[PDB]
Amino acid sequence: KETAAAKFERQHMDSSSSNYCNQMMKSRNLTKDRCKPVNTFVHESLADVQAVCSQKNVACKNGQTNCYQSYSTMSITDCRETGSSKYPNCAYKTTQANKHIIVACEGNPYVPVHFDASV
């Protein structure tokens, strides 16, 4: 039984090229039952990302209040599915950027359970 905390780590953490999204979307199991349309990976430490749960409190896109925006920019990769992609050969446009991330956090201890957005 995978925790929400772990599913966040699996779906969104890569603390370690044009190739990256195709592989990593597969490796992280996000291509397993459908081609997940969009996903972001965060190239920062687990510790830095978890500290976001005590950084800037902002509204979540679903209207809940447990979202937190990173005071610093962070290195991330957006994977966006290309219009030529057909399941089970999921095709992704990889893109780098440094931006502030926004995560929803929950639990005791209070940790990131969902990637809301990047700005």
Curated annotation (Swiss-Prot):
The annotated active site, in chain numbering, is 12 (proton acceptor), 114 (proton donor)
One GO biological-process annotation of the entry reads: defense response to Gram-positive bacterium
Domain of life where this protein originates: Eukaryota
UniProt keyword list: Disulfide bond, Endonuclease, Glycation, Glycoprotein, Hydrolase, Lyase, Nuclease, Secreted, Signal
Residues bound to substrate: 7, 10, 36-40, 61, 80
Which molecular-function annotations from GO does this UniProt entry contain? lyase activity; nucleic acid binding; ribonuclease A activity; RNA nuclease activity
Expression by tissue: Pancreas.
Q: What subcellular compartments does it reside in?
A: Secreted
Q: How does it assemble?
A: Interacts with and forms tight 1:1 complexes with RNH1. Dimerization of two such complexes may occur. Interaction with RNH1 inhibits this protein. Monomer.
Tell me the protein's name: Ribonuclease pancreatic
Origin organism is Bos taurus (Bovine)
The shown residues of the full protein are 27 to 150 of 150
